[PDB]
């Protein structure tokens, strides 16, 4: 009765309306609704951090790495962490879509 | 396990020699160095 879900891609692209989704999650926080020093709000609270990060990851689709977890002391890097894109395209894939000249031939034998 | 190739290295330069010198590694090596 246990069926494995399909593997999900590791590529995450920042939403165009990142602030709108971001402030929506900040509103999800208990009464914050973009308060004073919103970017400087401390995340040291375990329960608040879990709720905020968990909700953001599900909606935005990007999750804080365990190794990078402790750097997420305040919001400022949370917004920065989500706004930096992540691409699953391989180097060969990027090279393929790089206006290859007519005399250059690439074949993937793997 | 590559001693044959070592002999071949001397032989390639000694193929044009005449007599037992061209086929004896003891003599072929000496001639090759002298030629160089």
């Amino acid at each position: 009765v246990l069926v494995c879900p399909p593997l999900r891609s590791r590529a995450y692209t920042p939403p165009s309306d990142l602030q709108s989704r971001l402030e929506s999650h900040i509103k999800e926080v208990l009464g914050s609704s973009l308060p004073n020093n919103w970017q400087d709000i401390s995340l040291d609270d375990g329960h608040m951090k879990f709720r905020l990060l968990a909700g953001l990851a599900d909606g935005l689709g990007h999750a804080v790495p365990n190794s990078r977890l402790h750097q997420m002391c305040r919001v400022r890097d949370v917004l920065d962490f989500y706004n930096v894109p992540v691409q699953d395209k391989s180097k060969f894939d990027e090279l393929v879509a790089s206006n290859l000249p007519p005399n250059l031939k690439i074949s993937w034998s793997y | 396990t590559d001693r044959y190739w070592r002999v071949q290295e001397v032989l390639k330069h000694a193929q044009h020699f005449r007599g037992r010198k061209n086929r004896c590694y003891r003599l072929a090596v000496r001639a090759v160095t002298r030629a160089f």
């Binding site: 090279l95 005399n103 793997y110 | -």
Partner: protein, 105 residues
Amino acid sequence: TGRGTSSRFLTSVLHNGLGRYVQQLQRLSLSLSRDAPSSRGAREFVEREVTDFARRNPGVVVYVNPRPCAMPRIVAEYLNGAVREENVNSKSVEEIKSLVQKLAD
């Protein structure tokens, strides 16, 4: 060694430079491996310098075939029929770039 080695006289392929200079090299073939220490320098070369060479010299056909391979190798074919193969086993990016430029000349 000269007595045991051949020699020739000065000559040109077909008087290449009388009207216009023609590049002898016509085709380049490259074999690479996804995971191989020997190909690390070649791996980076494809990332950075392969495109620049192709733009600089668009008249040479370049074949790049990443494949499971023990030793990466480069094969160069010339118009007159000369074909030369160079092993790229454990060679740096700078070494590779210089070699290709020498082959073209």
